[PDB]
PDB file of C-alpha atoms in Angstrom:
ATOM      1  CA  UNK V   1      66.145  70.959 111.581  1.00  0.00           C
ATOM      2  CA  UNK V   2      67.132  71.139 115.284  1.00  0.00           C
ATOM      3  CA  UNK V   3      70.863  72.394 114.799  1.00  0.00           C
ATOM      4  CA  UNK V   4      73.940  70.736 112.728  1.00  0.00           C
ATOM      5  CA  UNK V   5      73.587  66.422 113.557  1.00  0.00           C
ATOM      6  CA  UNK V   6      75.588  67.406 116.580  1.00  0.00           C
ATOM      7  CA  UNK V   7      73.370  67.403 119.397  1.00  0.00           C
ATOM      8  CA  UNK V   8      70.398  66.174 117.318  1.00  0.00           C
TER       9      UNK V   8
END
């Protein structure tokens, strides 16, 4: 959840 690990 909340995108790819990227950001979150």
């Amino acid at each position: 959840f909340x995108x790819s690990x990227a950001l979150l």
